[PDB]
């Protein structure tokens, strides 16, 4: 996260760290959506252009964390993966269209002050909140700058951007399964997700029922926090039918 700040304790209890076993290192962010299901970006698990293709046994998920590198004894919980599900139409060849994956845990994680699931949006909450100018919140342990790494979880609030502005900011083909967010050069304020934040949540707090909803997944961006560029996020509601199908099935 670039130009963000230290998270408060328990601020983002759905935040998950995707952890490589060997060598032990941060792979990506992710989010807790139930006691056994974790949501992330497909490209965190599968990206052939970079020879990335992780299997279940390569990975751990670490839940309830604040510190990036510390083993947070009596606070974090570490879970093994039962199965990875990548969207069958995930487009790694071109533009990361449908950049979404589910991971089922081997055992349910116990909820605590530090561990708690985020809501997934209904059609109405999505229609109400996914509007240009409305701000969401992005969290992660990724790079502090484009070109080091934070001591603790970082947080930044960023406005959703008009789709024509998103489209005009890039040569990449944007799809309805994406949205972009961030400040314009003229707005003064800044901030962005960055490498290592991928798979983490873009959340919004509903003013109707005071619950946090995950609207986006950190997906891609050209550099980090560049003037005139924006962060792109997987549109969670647009892919919710697939999410439900997987959870109903498995």
């Amino acid at each position: 996260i670039v130009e963000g700040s230290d998270a408060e304790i328990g601020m983002s209890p759905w935040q998950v760290m995707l952890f490589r076993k060997s060598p032990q290192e941060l792979l990506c962010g992710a989010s807790l959506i139930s006691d056994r299901w974790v949501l992330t970006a497909a490209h965190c698990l599968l990206y052939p252009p970079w020879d990335k293709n992780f299997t279940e046994n390569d990975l751990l998920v670490r839940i309830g964390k604040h510190s990036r590198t510390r083993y947070e004894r009596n606070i974090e919980k570490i879970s093994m993966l039962e199965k990875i599900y990548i969207h069958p139409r995930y487009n790694w060849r071109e533009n990361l269209d449908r950049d979404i994956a589910l991971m089922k845990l081997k055992k349910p994680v116990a909820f605590s002050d530090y561990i708690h699931p985020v809501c997934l949006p209904d059609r109405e909450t999505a229609a109400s909140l996914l509007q240009a100018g409305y701000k969401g919140r992005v969290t992660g342990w990724g790079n502090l700058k484009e070109t080091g790494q934070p001591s603790v979880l970082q947080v930044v609030n960023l406005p959703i951007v008009e789709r024509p502005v998103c489209k005009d900011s890039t040569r990449i083909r944007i799809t309805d399964n994406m949205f972009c967010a961030g400040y314009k050069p003229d707005e003064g304020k800044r901030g962005d997700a960055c490498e290592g934040d991928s798979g983490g949540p873009f959340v919004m707090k509903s003013p109707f029922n005071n619950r946090w909803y995950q609207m986006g997944i950190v997906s891609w961006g050209e550099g980090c926090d560049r003037d005139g560029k924006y962060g792109f996020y997987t549109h969670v509601f647009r892919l919710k039918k697939w999410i439900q199908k997987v959870i109903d099935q498995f």
């Binding site: 032990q24 590198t69 510390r70 093994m80």
Partner: peptide
Amino acid sequence: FEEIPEEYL
């Protein structure tokens, strides 16, 4: 990164 308990490996 601090080593994590062996049980998780």
